[PDB]
Design an enzyme around this catalytic site. Structure first.
Site, PDB file in Angstrom:
ATOM      1  N   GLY E  31     -50.732 -64.290  16.612  1.00  0.00           N
ATOM      2  CA  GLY E  31     -51.034 -65.464  17.532  1.00  0.00           C
ATOM      3  C   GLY E  31     -52.505 -66.213  17.147  1.00  0.00           C
ATOM      4  N   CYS E 240     -23.136 -83.783  15.220  1.00  0.00           N
ATOM      5  CA  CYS E 240     -23.249 -84.204  13.862  1.00  0.00           C
ATOM      6  C   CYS E 240     -22.134 -85.163  13.205  1.00  0.00           C
ATOM      7  CB  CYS E 240     -23.482 -83.294  12.711  1.00  0.00           C
ATOM      8  SG  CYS E 240     -23.819 -83.623  11.222  1.00  0.00           S
ATOM      9  N   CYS E 243     -20.891 -83.035   9.892  1.00  0.00           N
ATOM     10  CA  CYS E 243     -20.135 -81.722  10.020  1.00  0.00           C
ATOM     11  C   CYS E 243     -19.725 -81.479  11.517  1.00  0.00           C
ATOM     12  CB  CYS E 243     -21.230 -80.410   9.610  1.00  0.00           C
ATOM     13  SG  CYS E 243     -22.367 -80.179  10.905  1.00  0.00           S
ATOM     14  N   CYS E 265     -27.370 -83.289  11.247  1.00  0.00           N
ATOM     15  CA  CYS E 265     -28.225 -82.423  11.272  1.00  0.00           C
ATOM     16  C   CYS E 265     -29.632 -82.558  10.614  1.00  0.00           C
ATOM     17  CB  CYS E 265     -27.338 -80.916  10.979  1.00  0.00           C
ATOM     18  SG  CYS E 265     -25.952 -80.635  11.602  1.00  0.00           S
ATOM     19  N   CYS E 271     -25.872 -77.923   7.570  1.00  0.00           N
ATOM     20  CA  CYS E 271     -24.773 -79.228   7.668  1.00  0.00           C
ATOM     21  C   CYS E 271     -23.889 -78.836   6.461  1.00  0.00           C
ATOM     22  CB  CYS E 271     -25.631 -80.536   7.470  1.00  0.00           C
ATOM     23  SG  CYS E 271     -24.558 -81.818   8.201  1.00  0.00           S
TER      24      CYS E 271
HETATM   25 ZN   LIG Z   1     -24.155 -81.440  10.342  1.00  0.00          ZN
END
Ligand SMILES: [Zn+2]
Ligand SMILES: Nc1ncnc2c1ncn2[C@@H]1O[C@H](COP(=O)(O)OP(=O)(O)O)[C@@H](O)[C@H]1O
Ligand SMILES: Nc1ncnc2c1ncn2[C@@H]1O[C@H](COP(=O)(O)OP(=O)(O)O)[C@@H](O)[C@H]1O
Ligand SMILES: O=P(O)(O)OC[C@H]1O[C@@H]2OP(=O)(O)O[C@@H]2[C@@H]1O
Ligand SMILES: O=P(O)(O)OC[C@H]1O[C@@H]2OP(=O)(O)O[C@@H]2[C@@H]1O
Ligand SMILES: [Mg+2]
Ligand SMILES: [Mg+2]
Ligand SMILES: [Zn+2]
Ligand SMILES: [Zn+2]
Ligand SMILES: [Zn+2]
Lengths: 253, 278, 353, 353, 278, 253
Positions: E31, E240, E243, E265, E271
């Site tokens: 970090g 989506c 998909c 997506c 996707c």
């Molecule tokens: Zn998708």
């Protein structure tokens, strides 16, 4: 005729914040103390009557001239040469990057003073008046303690011998000894030079020893007024009774 | 004459008229910075555009123009401005102060006293005498409106407390007609006295900053000072190396790397007159 | 003894001749043509047009040639030339929806109506010095697609129709003209935008960059950047009806900024606007970013960066003024400096006493 | 239903081809040569060299040609090319007293040892567009004077010998190199000057201009500006003694600034320093002014302008960084903008509930 | 292979070694923003130079490089960076997350979980999570040194008091290994959970700002939130459009001027996998 | 063992400005008053003992750890979670652009609080504790009066129930009623939670009612110290006698 006359003065940031329907007179050689709850509108009122906050309602007359009907130039001329203003926060009334000597001498030069040596001598004399060592004249206020800044502001606003001084809690940050010095100085100025003072204070002892009359403010309204001794010793309003009862009692040995 | 393809004095009539109205307002309000819609000139901003515009708006065919920079007519920028005016007006030009009807100057007032009907036009970088105390116009405008001149007095007093003297040596602020604090342009303090009760009209142009102001003839111009620190002008231990004058502002000419120098009048016309007298 | 002599005029003439010879350079090389600069150094021309105030590509190229490529000097040349010309008309307001697009992109949506039209750009090039340009070459034979320009509505219109942004409404207010009246702070948004369009590209870019780094953040997204030809129309007094006088190549940038939640309306995105001559975009983007920054008084924003300080930004934005005043130090200053020297010598003598 | 298709690579290639064709412009005109840009647009080349970090006129001209005159893109091209080259040596410190002068002026004295040498300059020209440059012309036949270069000591040396200024002494401190280690604020003066030399000309000019207008005043006088050829020498490990590798055209600016009165020494002028490649001066002047402004911590000065704010000035000075980050908004940002949109829509729904 | 005239991966060995030391320090200090002497790339600052330098310093001949921007491999800048790496290294490249050994990304973490020996390299504009609260590095450095993170907590609480929600939606700050407040790059809040206890090593490069930091595998990464305002990820009312996935970050495609849109997506590889499954 | 131990502590801006050779102990459930002349070094000493000003000489030990030998991180952790500091100027102890609720809740979140509703409820409860209306929670301190800012600072520095609170003139700008409320609050915290307090004050009544011991400071030197009542009623040093004599006496009706 009153030096300052306040009639039905009102300024509210919101319904309860500020002051509403405030009326009083002030004459020369007199002290009007203002006491009340923190956040009751005392600083707002002091700004409004000192030509620093335009009221929403009511009128302020100075020497029979409406304060906010005058030109801005006239108001600034009054605040430069005629009036004194001591702010609740001392630095708000000081020039941070200007020495103490310069902070005092600005006001003198505003009144026509044009001799550097005399201005410096007067500044040193007034530093000694408020028990600030004269060898601090060339130091900036940022190097001053809070009480030292307060006293520098007072000296700056009293050096020109103004006819009217507004003060917001001038004893803040002052030890009792220098506080007594300041009270004597102000009383002497009032009695001799006929100076008029409007002083906001939370120290009821200072109000009793200095204020000729009192205004008690609660939630933006003057709930009680009159002779200082009468208000403090014979309070009629419940809030004034509570305030006087909250005073820290002392004992005599 | 004007045979360059440009309007007389290179400004269109609308710009001349706007500047002329500004000049009249400035005259009626001595020391006050009159804003004006100035235009870009063939000289860059900061190289005298305000003075150029003023001269173009006032100059006529019968005027005898004198242009000086650092008190000298032959200075590079003086030559440039004068050649420009010769091109776009054809007016007669002179290096002699007493024969000039218009004098455009940068940082000097001539040693030769000015006379009635003469106009002296100053080139001004910073028309606001409070600018170096308060960089913002939003504040200095109000301070001039309300005559709130305390920051200037405080600056002077702090200067005395710090160094024992006022630190400003040129563009020394002056109170005009008892009211307006005015920047006299970058003239050395030596020249400030000449501005008081002078028979000639003084005009001041700041083209980049878009201001015009004026001091009418016979107007009080008093340098800000103190009784115990009175206004004092520059002095030198040497006279002019050429004419021998002890009453003129001197410029220091470095002659060699070994520290040898001489001092000679900044006012070259005055120097020539003195040299011819002797 | 020493006698004064005249040297100013001849020295100046010699200096200018030297500069002209340097500008010409080696005479074995052909002299550059203004047409060549206009065509092949077109982004410099875009900057010179935008900051000089005249959208004439040939004049900007001429100024660049005369300035030996010095963009500041060329900008000043064009700006000064502006003063010699008469204002024959004032255009009707431009309508950027009618622009014939050379390039149109939006960062806020992957795809938009009208598509992402990259057009001619250096974006996504690998900045490797192309040494083949040291000799003559052949420009690529451009591939061709369908010739129709698909409808390309402004992305902010699609934002506003959803209620996500506020339409920029026209109340008929008369624009301020800082070319005729000096600016009065605080300036209206019209004056501020006029000044920004004329402002130094680098200064405004640095200010916008500082805003992106937290000095007065405005949470900007490039809602839409368009570059194309926009028609200019006037209404001559002779005829009384609008005439099209031609078209100008211009770039327009609309930035989405930080949303706000006003007391009595739904929260919505703020916005900034940039508009420049030619194809160079970063001036338009910086102009929009700084315009949003200077919108702070309208939105009651507590300033956290110099980009929000209106007077500081605008008073020093015009590089004509800034370059002129910085260069003026080259002028003789020996009277002044002598005034300084006298004081300093007296101070030293007093301290050493 | 909708199916994803590949469009990125071909769109990018087409965009780059379009940009290359626009750069070539009208093929009826001869293609610009890098030699022509180097010779006749030499001030643009000076800026590109100074800000790109490589003092190679041909490379700067090549970058300008490749950038279509875009000074920012050319600066980035040269800066990126720097990364591909090895550091074969580190020069011995430059000695500007050995410069072969093209130009030498001083504003603080009317005349100085060595004289006011205006050299090639646009100073004192009347900025009237020269339309004769629209066609081929003849460069002026230069007049000639004596060929000897008179001794030209630095004006600050003459100031310091009088005690008016302080000699810049060399304690042998190792300079910081911001090209190898990222800057750490507060930076040493060496790091600050290195960054200023690489800084955006317009940004620094505006900052210096603001200082002249009271935002952190430093009371500057152009003590000396020199432009000329300075020899570069190295000490190769192979031979162990100094060798002169050539000479570079450079401009040096020394500014006299406001005097100070230290507790335990006579009061004296402060000073600023600027150094750039080529003839263009205003970058050097602005660099000196901003260097003096950033000297505030050394002199215990209370800041009155952003030019004295070290981090604000230096972090946004490099136009490679600033231009890159402002332009990056052109990149697709639709994921982040979608997150922003989701939040804003929820806020609107909640307010309207 | 590398057949372009440049060193492998375009960086000289000294720069690679410096960056590698920086990477090792970053890993050892999760970090923490490790300064590094980054160089100017063929891409402008702000277009992924830090990620480019990291990938060049880590990549080898057998690595399979995946480059994504907005979750898509075909994005303009992703294509540019990937083509550059193909030119200067010749490495195999893939759009499939599960086949990539190195993933350089801008603003997305792939939906497909990462696996051991995978390295994901984030492009970071602002490596300082406190920058928009405190613009100055001189202050944020000290705040990280002293773990003085109150301004961030105050920002979050004031956001809740003003809007009822935390205003930050991407680049959402995260506490790493219980100590360091870190900027996760401008990934959406949707992706922040994926950073917690992930088998892959995460590297973060800010070339313009000259910082490198890292999250080693299996390290705690916790988004700053409140118990009554817990960390919540972006949600959409639609799946989506291609998909049909309801578990992916969606991008809004505006189809026509009449307000018709679709959501698809952002992770195009995910996707494609989902579309092939159905 | 003392919660705080100060030995030969010195910090001088110049010869006389600040404090020199200051030594005292403090334990839990105790209140050390500091009184003296304005400009005597009280604020300087309070800063030095509160890990805000490195002394030139002497040592400060907190729970048997040298204060300035610790890391800066440890000192800041103490000032975040363990200690409270009330500044002479209230705004110096507040975030100007952060609401009162946020100003209070910063400290709670520094102690691990992570429930927004509970933090807000605690902030409102503490606003009511100092008699600030709970409907001012979302207002910025710039809209508060001086006394309201003072009370907000006190609430912010007491909300985490610290083991040690340094206060510089905490009653400044407070009316006597709210001053009494604050005195009761502090006394209750001290007695119940064993809170330790170092309070600089110019109100000798507050010192008498609150401080168990007193230090009297003149020109940077502790000229007298001991039991509060003994110092105020049986002062030995001339300056302490002058200070007590300068108190404004009150009367009972
Ligand atoms: Zn998708
Ligand atoms: N700028 C402001 N905006 C809103 N409210 C304010 C502002 N200034 C003061 N107030 C409010 O007005 C009331 C009066 O304040 P003030 O006159 O300063 O009180 P006091 O009598 O304690 O000095 C307070 O309750 C305060 O919160
Ligand atoms: N930054 C500073 N520089 C120089 N002197 C200072 C500084 N701060 C405070 N002082 C001086 O130190 C002394 C002690 O100040 P302080 O402790 O604030 O007094 P008080 O006890 O009234 O709070 C004062 O005389 C003051 O002028
Ligand atoms: O703004 P402009 O164009 O009218 O130039 C006014 C003045 O600004 C510069 O500063 P300077 O006093 O040294 O002399 C120059 C010039 O005369
Ligand atoms: O400084 P660099 O060159 O390493 O670029 C890092 C990031 O800065 C820009 O902002 P972004 O997050 O939108 O994406 C760009 C880029 O990925
Ligand atoms: Mg008050
Ligand atoms: Mg104190
Ligand atoms: Zn003479
Ligand atoms: Zn000047
Ligand atoms: Zn971005």
């Amino acid at each position: 005729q009153p030096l300052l006359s306040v009639n039905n003065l009102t300024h509210l940031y919101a319904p309860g914040k500020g002051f509403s329907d405030v009326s009083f007179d002030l004459w020369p050689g007199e002290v009007l103390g203002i006491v009340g709850e923190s956040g009751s509108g005392k600083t707002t009122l002091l700004k409004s009557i000192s030509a620093r906050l335009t009221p929403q309602q009511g009128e302020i007359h100075y020497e029979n001239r409406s304060l906010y009907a005058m030109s801005e130039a006239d108001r600034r001329r009054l605040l430069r040469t005629e009036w004194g203003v001591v702010h609740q926060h001392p630095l708000d009334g000081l020039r941070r990057q200007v020495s103490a000597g310069g902070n005092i001498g600005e006001r003198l030069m505003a009144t026509g003073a044009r001799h550097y040596g005399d201005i410096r001598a007067t500044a040193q004399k007034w530093l000694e008046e408020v028990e600030i060592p004269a060898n601090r004249i060339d130091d900036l206020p940022t190097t001053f303690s809070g009480g030292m800044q307060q006293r520098l502001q007072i000296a700056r606003n009293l050096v020109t011998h103004p006819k009217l001084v507004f003060m917001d809690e001038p004893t803040g940050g002052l030890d009792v000894s220098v506080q007594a010095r300041l009270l004597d100085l102000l009383r002497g100025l009032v009695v001799e030079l006929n100076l008029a003072v409007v002083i906001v204070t939370h120290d009821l002892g200072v109000a009793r020893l200095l204020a000729d009359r009192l205004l008690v403010m609660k939630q933006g309204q003057v709930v009680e007024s009159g002779l200082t001794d009468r208000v403090l010793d014979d309070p009629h309003h419940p809030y004034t009774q509570l305030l006087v009862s909250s005073v820290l009692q002392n004992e005599n040995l | 004459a004007n045979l360059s393809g440009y309007n007389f004095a290179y400004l269109d009539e609308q710009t001349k008229r706007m500047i002329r109205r500004a000049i009249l307002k400035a005259v009626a309000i001595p020391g006050y910075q009159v804003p004006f819609g100035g235009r870009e000139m063939p000289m860059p901003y900061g190289w005298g555009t305000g003075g150029i515009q003023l001269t173009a708006s006032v100059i006529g065919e019968s005027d005898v123009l004198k242009v000086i920079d650092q008190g000298a007519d032959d200075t590079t920028n003086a030559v440039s401005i004068r050649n420009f005016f010769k091109r776009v007006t054809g007016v007669n030009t002179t290096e002699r102060t007493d024969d000039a009807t218009l004098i455009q100057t940068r940082h000097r007032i001539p040693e030769t006293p000015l006379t009635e009907d003469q106009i002296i036009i100053f080139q001004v970088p910073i028309p606001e005498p409070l600018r170096f105390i308060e960089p913002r116009e939003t504040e200095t405008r109000t301070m001039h409106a309300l005559e709130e001149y305390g920051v200037m007095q405080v600056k002077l007093y702090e200067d005395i407390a710090r160094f024992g003297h006022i630190a400003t040596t040129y563009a020394y602020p002056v109170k005009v007609n008892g009211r307006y604090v005015m920047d006299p342009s970058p003239i050395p303090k030596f020249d400030n006295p000449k501005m008081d009760m002078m028979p000639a009209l003084q005009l001041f142009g700041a083209g980049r900053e878009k201001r015009i102001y004026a001091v009418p003839p016979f107007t009080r111009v008093e340098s800000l000072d103190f009784d115990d620190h009175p206004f004092t002008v520059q002095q030198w231990d040497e006279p002019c190396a050429i004419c021998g004058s002890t009453h003129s502002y001197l410029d220091e000419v470095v002659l060699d790397d070994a520290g040898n120098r001489m001092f000679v009048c900044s006012d070259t016309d005055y120097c020539r007159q003195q040299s011819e007298a002797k | 003894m020493y006698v004064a002599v005249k040297g100013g005029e001849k020295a100046i003439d010699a200096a200018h001749a030297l500069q002209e010879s340097r500008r010409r350079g080696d005479t074995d090389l052909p002299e550059l043509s203004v047409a060549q600069i206009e065509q092949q150094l077109n982004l410099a021309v875009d900057r010179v047009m935008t900051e000089g105030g005249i959208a004439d590509r040939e004049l900007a190229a001429l100024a660049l040639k005369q300035a030996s490529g010095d963009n500041v000097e060329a900008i000043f040349l064009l700006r000064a030339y502006r003063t010699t010309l008469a204002k024959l008309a004032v255009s009707e307001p431009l309508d950027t929806t009618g622009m014939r697009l050379e390039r149109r992109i939006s960062a806020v949506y992957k795809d938009i109506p009208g598509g992402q039209l990259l057009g001619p750009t250096y974006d996504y090039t690998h900045r490797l010095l192309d040494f083949t340009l040291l000799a003559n070459g052949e420009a690529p034979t451009l591939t061709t697609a369908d010739s129709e320009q698909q409808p390309s509505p402004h992305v902010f219109s699609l934002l506003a129709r959803q209620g996500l942004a506020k339409f920029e409404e026209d109340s008929g207010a008369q624009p301020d003209d800082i070319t005729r009246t000096p600016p009065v702070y605080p300036c209206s948004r019209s004056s501020r935008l006029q000044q920004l369009m004329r402002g130094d590209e680098g200064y405004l870019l640095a200010l916008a960059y500082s805003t992106q780094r937290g000095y007065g953040r405005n949470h900007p997204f490039a809602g839409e950047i368009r570059s194309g030809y926009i028609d200019v129309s006037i209404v001559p007094e002779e005829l009384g009806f609008a005439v099209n006088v031609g078209e100008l190549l211009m770039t327009e940038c609309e930035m989405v900024n930080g949303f706000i939640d006003p007391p009595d309306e739904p929260p919505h995105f703020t916005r900034g606007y940039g508009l420049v001559f030619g194809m160079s975009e970063r001036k338009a983007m910086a102009m929009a970013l700084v315009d949003r920054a200077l919108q702070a008084p309208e939105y009651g924003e507590h300033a956290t960066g110099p980009a929000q300080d209106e007077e500081f930004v605008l008073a020093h934005a015009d590089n004509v003024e800034a370059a002129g005043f910085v260069s003026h130090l080259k002028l003789p200053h020996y009277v002044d400096f002598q005034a300084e020297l006298e004081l300093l010598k007296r101070l030293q003598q007093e301290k050493n006493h």
